[PDB]
Design a protein around this ligand. Structure first.
Ligand SMILES: [Mg+2]
Ligand SMILES: [Mg+2]
Ligand SMILES: [Mg+2]
Ligand SMILES: [Mg+2]
Ligand SMILES: [Mg+2]
Ligand SMILES: [Mg+2]
Ligand SMILES: [Mg+2]
Ligand SMILES: [Mg+2]
Ligand SMILES: [Mg+2]
Ligand SMILES: [Mg+2]
Ligand SMILES: [Mg+2]
Ligand SMILES: [Mg+2]
Ligand SMILES: [Mg+2]
Ligand SMILES: [Mg+2]
Lengths: 164, 258, 143, 167
RNA sequence: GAAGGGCCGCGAGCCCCCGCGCCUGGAGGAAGGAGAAGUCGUAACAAGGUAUCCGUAGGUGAACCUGCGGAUGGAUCCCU
RNA sequence: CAUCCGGUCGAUCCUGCCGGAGCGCGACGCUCUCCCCAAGGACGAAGCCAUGCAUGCCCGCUCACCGGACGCGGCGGACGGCUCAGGACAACGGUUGCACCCCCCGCGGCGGUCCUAGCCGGACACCGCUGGCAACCCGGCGCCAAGACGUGCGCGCAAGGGCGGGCGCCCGGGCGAGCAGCGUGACGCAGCGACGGCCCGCCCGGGCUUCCGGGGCAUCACCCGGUCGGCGCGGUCGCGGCGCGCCGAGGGCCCGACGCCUGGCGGAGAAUCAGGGUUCGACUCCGGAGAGCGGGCCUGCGAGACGGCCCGCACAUCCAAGGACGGCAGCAGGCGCGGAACUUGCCCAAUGCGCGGCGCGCGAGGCAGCGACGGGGAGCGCGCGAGCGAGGCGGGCCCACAGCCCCCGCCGCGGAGCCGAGGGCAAGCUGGUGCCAGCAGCCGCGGUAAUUCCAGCUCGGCGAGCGUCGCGCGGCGCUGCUGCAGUUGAAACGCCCGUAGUUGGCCCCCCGCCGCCACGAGGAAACGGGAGCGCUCCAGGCAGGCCCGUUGGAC
């Protein structure tokens, strides 16, 4: 057969079981306005990733502290979270993870990091600027609004040298 | 049921320890019959193309081999699918590179560079003694070689040193408690240790208990226990001495190399 | 207790469930086979047939109306069914001896609404969706 | 053709198994040789190409064989006269058909030409002074193309003598 | 050593008979369901105007009636 | 990632079902800006097939024409590719064995052959002359080659057969295991040898075989008669009722036989989602089976082979009417059928296979084309002025040739639909019609305000996607092991005895056995989980950096 048959693929998001729920609609619209999200698939993606992290943390927490698997997996998970900036550096216990929330994921988006740096007037302005390729990360132009910046690259985000 | 023997090999059906990319292609090389079997060998092209990188395609390897640029146990081989196995001698005079094919702790084939003094021989495991035509005693080994008129003092599962130039036995190591060994099959490929116990069950397998240098103990069946000397190895071994680190230490080493 | 609970009683429990799960109407209707042999569509989403008579059916007691339907004969079975074209003024687009595509209602095989003994819907005629003809997206000047 | 596959049989409960493939060449058989004693005519042996290129030879007609007297360690090639007893069936005897286990009469000349002068078993010597000696067949004609055997000795000889004497 | 012939073995196809499974016509007979604002009476719900019901047997245009035995889910938790 | 809501009444609490709300697989319908990945005549027609392609290569043998042709000879064509008809103690999955077996290439050994050897004999093919027939097909005569055929120079060597151990058992060639080999008395001269290979071992593969698992119906309760076992021969690569003769009578069954049915290929796995589970598994890897139906056979190590031959049956073709010829469930394409499914394209450059020394071939496979099955990423503006997209014209990079992505220059098409607005369930204003026309999954609306029909305004949900139909999971503690119910709602046999079956008080300090728990060996990946790595992110992939654990692909 064609080698293209062995290529993998998967979905990335989940839809709520009860759609018409007033508080949920209000909160989702509030978040969309605050962070200027395009559609409601982004929130579903964030919820999916958060659920994955929470499930991993639960499974690890069920075990004993001195379980080799627990140590290995918790160390990897904490390192990833710290490198990504989602979890604060000073927290190094698996319990703290279960308290995380999607807003922490959102705060690490490129729009957010360039807005808190005073490099853009607004999230909408940030998106428009990102599309036109006036921005760079570590000397490389990034035009994806949902691109997530690691902590080590936070000070390396600047305006594109070649942009007008 | 196929009406005859099999000539092809799907890539997904190839051995794991060959380390072949899923997207490389539909097919993988099918080794030809020779000194070693399909699951205890690795084709020459894989070594010459995907490791040493002296070639980038099948055709280049074909030219290199048909121009006589590699010697296996002192004999030039022109077959790209010739099987290479354990304790084989890989010499390339054009670049003065000499390697002995051994196992790493992870359980894969590795090339340990050697010297001139020890490249005139190899170690073989004797696993079968039988009478041939005219009642003449014989002896076979793991690399598909037979020797007539062996010494009566040589028994099964022993290890034999033979000169590459001449297939003549020099000295032999007995299978006994207290002898350094190397594991060549299963979950413990590449580990080195000393025999501590031997337990036999009538009509079934014989289990061998070995202890590593650090005090770790492990078990394996006698079918893949290889003697490599008398308390000290007879050949040069990889930089590591048959110590398998745990996942934690391997992760630390990876992070350090990052 | 009422149910057997011994450590070596798996066979009896399996047999009990095997026998007793045939008492559910849904499970029978699905796994018995009579419905499949009796359903004119043989487990298909929809079928293709020929209309042969255009008729109107009265509604039930608490309602008062005459619903517009047609009689159809399925090509692959040669049996007869009654299919109902709901959309307003869409009977005039259907002509006698015309090729149609007929699907089901919301419920699997029960009557829907006040229409008595009708279980099928017309969706395509002459190759054009009725919903599209009703909205004037396309025209049936080929017929 | 002829086959010995077990798919065409019944099960241990007496049930019909069913068939799931066509006939295969590994499971074939062949018509029997039915080797005949000679008593255009002569020794005729055929050859069969068997699986793996191996060669099998079945005898159709033959008249001689090698026979051994174990007690005295005497062995010669002798002519076979006729078949006189067979346990499987009397039809084979009537037709003088040679198979392993047949009881035959051989000519006595090669043995009497050197015997009747040394102390040995009385019965074999009494046979020797006559025209024929009772013997048995130990090879498989139809597989190796030969008919060899040995001269009967003690209790088995008594058994077969008591069997064929009334006839 | 060819054509050709004889006997056995593998075994197609056709004929005959038997059995199994799935569909199907049929005068007449008989059930059920739906539709309407049809004709004859009032069996049940109140002591429903003869308390109701169960089993069995017979009878009658129809619901039903009567005989033997039983129950209260009765209209009675109450009398030397 | 442990959720409920509307409907029996004049009102109320229950049982109990109907309906709604989510995910996935397909089909239908509306619509559609850009990029990346990607399935694609399987769904009671394993129905029928014009047209073209899908297996060749070459060492040996040149007085052929000017060595290339051609032919003999050798290797290969039994792999690969397609499909799931048939088959329900079978296939298949895990676990044993052959001390009952066969095996090409390849690797390593070994290599003694009874009774013209400066090199043996005769032919055929191609080719020349003469010819038949519509076609397909061949005939006769004639010089010539071999790593072709036959004969065969030589120190005895194939198959098979007879004899050769013990004294209760156990304590080398080799085993757990009297298995191998050898000697000796007779038979027989098989194979190798006109440029030396018979034979042995290993390897891959196959054949059978132990143990465990392996669909439904009891309106199928008894079934089998080479069926069960024993003796003997035959045949087979080989064990064996595998076949034949004789003897005896057995074997299986509620722990479900036998029979019947299946729109029945199996597994690795997929969908769904608290935990326990339910349903599916044509299709990527492994294994099996088949090539219109049913049978038979040659060549060969290997086929009961069908892009090999012979016959019967059902179809089909050409005929200058005597004869000849075929098998797409291989790639494209066509008819029929159906709700349902693409170009009669280019190339071996990559991965491999066959042959072979500086290479050929391969509809395997790769590249492109159609493609809203489907998955992933951006966008139809921000602001009081600037800026950037798509698109076009050119240059690079890439590519077997070309596109595509990406980079560089000059001009610069800014486009949203599908459903709904009484409740469940988020979202209301005029005009018509008048229980008609129509809506409505359920409750219900419509007999002059119609908050529900048809229109306009406005509003809501998702969004380049939205809606409708059918199926599966969930909802459902409405199949209940976890975990239902059984006075009155549906449901305790009229009662007793009783075999299979299920369940059985307390007690021994340690031994053996079964279950049980833990650890371990051994055994494919892919999928799933999971460590590390900025394909610009992502779906993905196993990469990659320079001053790399032996860079890595752990488990
Ligand atoms: Mg009354
Ligand atoms: Mg009354
Ligand atoms: Mg009453
Ligand atoms: Mg000779
Ligand atoms: Mg010759
Ligand atoms: Mg089938
Ligand atoms: Mg397959
Ligand atoms: Mg086949
Ligand atoms: Mg065939
Ligand atoms: Mg074909
Ligand atoms: Mg083929
Ligand atoms: Mg209930
Ligand atoms: Mg009642
Ligand atoms: Mg009741």
């Amino acid at each position: 057969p064609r080698i293209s048959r062995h290529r993998n693929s998967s979905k990335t998001y989940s839809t709520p079981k009860k759609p018409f729920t007033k508080p949920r609609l209000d909160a989702e619209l509030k978040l969309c306005g605050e962070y200027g999200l395009k559609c409601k698939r982004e929130i579903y993606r964030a919820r999916y990733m958060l659920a994955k992290i929470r499930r991993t943390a639960r499974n690890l927490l069920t075990l004993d502290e001195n379980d080799i698997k627990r140590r290995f997996e918790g160390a990897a998970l904490l390192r990833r979270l710290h490198m990504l900036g989602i979890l604060d550096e000073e927290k190094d216990q698996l319990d703290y993870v279960l308290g995380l929330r999607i807003e922490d994921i959102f705060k690490r988006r490129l729009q957010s990091v360039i807005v808190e740096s005073k490099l853009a007037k607004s999230v909408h302005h940030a998106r428009n600027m990102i599309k036109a390729r006036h921005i760079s990360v570590g000397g490389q132009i990034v035009n994806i609004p949902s691109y997530m910046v690691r902590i080590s690259n936070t000070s390396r985000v600047a305006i594109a040298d070649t942009s007008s | 049921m196929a009406r005859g023997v099999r000539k092809h090999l799907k890539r997904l059906n190839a051995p794991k320890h060959w380390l072949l990319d899923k997207m490389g292609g539909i097919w993988a090389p099918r080794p030809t019959n020779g000194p070693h079997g399909l699951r205890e060998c690795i084709p020459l092209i894989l070594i010459l193309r995907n490791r040493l990188h002296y070639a980038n395609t099948y055709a280049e390897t074909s030219m290199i081999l048909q121009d006589k640029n590699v010697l296996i146990d002192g004999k030039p081989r022109t077959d790209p699918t010739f099987p290479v196995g354990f304790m084989d001698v890989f010499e390339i005079p054009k670049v003065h590179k000499t390697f002995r094919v051994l196992y790493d702790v992870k359980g894969r084939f590795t090339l340990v560079p050697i010297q001139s003094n020890e490249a005139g021989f190899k170690l073989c495991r004797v696993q079968k003694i039988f009478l041939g035509d005219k009642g003449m005693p014989y002896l076979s080994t793991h690399d598909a070689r037979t020797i007539r008129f062996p010494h009566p003092d040589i028994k099964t599962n022993d290890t034999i040193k033979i000169n590459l130039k001449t297939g003549k036995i020099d000295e032999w190591y007995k299978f006994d408690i207290g002898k350094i060994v190397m594991v060549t099959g299963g979950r413990n490929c590449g580990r080195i240790g000393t025999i501590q116990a031997i337990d036999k069950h009538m009509g079934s397998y014989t289990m061998i208990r070995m202890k590593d240098t650090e005090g770790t103990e492990f078990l394996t069946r006698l079918c893949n226990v290889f003697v490599i000397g008398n308390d000290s190895p007879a050949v040069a071994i990889p930089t590591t001495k048959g110590i398998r680190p745990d996942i934690i230490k391997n992760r630390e080493l990876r992070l350090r190399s990052i | 207790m009422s149910k057997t609970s011994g450590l070596y009683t798996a066979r009896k429990l399996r047999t009990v469930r095997r026998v007793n799960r045939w008492a559910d109407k849904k499970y029978r209707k699905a796994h018995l086979g009579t419905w499949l042999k009796a359903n004119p569509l043989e487990g298909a989403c929809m079928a293709r047939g020929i209309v042969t008579q255009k008729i109107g059916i009265s509604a039930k007691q608490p309602n008062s109306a005459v619903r517009k339907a047609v009689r159809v004969q399925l090509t692959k079975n040669s049996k007869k069914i009654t299919a109902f074209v709901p959309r307003d003024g869409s009977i005039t687009y259907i002509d006698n001896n015309d090729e149609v595509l007929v699907a089901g209602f919301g419920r699997a095989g029960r009557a829907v609404g006040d229409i008595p003994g009708c279980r099928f819907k017309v969706i395509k005629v002459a190759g054009i969706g009725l919903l599209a003809l009703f909205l004037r997206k396309r025209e049936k000047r080929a017929r | 053709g002829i086959t010995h596959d077990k798919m065409y049989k019944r099960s241990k409960t007496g049930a019909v198994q069913g068939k799931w493939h066509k006939k295969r060449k590994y499971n074939l058989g062949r018509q029997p040789a039915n080797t005949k004693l000679i008593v255009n005519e002569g020794q005729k042996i055929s050859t069969i190409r068997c699986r793996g290129g191996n060669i099998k030879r079945r005898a159709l007609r033959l008249s001689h064989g090698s026979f051994a007297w174990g007690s005295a360690d005497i062995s010669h090639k002798a002519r076979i006269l006729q078949v006189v007893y067979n346990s499987t069936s009397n039809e084979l005897v009537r037709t003088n058909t040679l198979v392993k286990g047949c009881v035959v009469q051989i000519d006595s000349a090669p043995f009497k030409s050197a015997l009747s002068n040394d102390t040995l078993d009385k019965e074999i010597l009494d046979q020797i002074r006559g025209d024929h000696i009772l013997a048995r067949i130990s090879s498989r004609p139809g597989q190796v193309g030969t008919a060899d055997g040995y001269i009967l000795e003690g209790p088995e000889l008594l058994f077969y003598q008591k069997k064929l004497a009334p006839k």
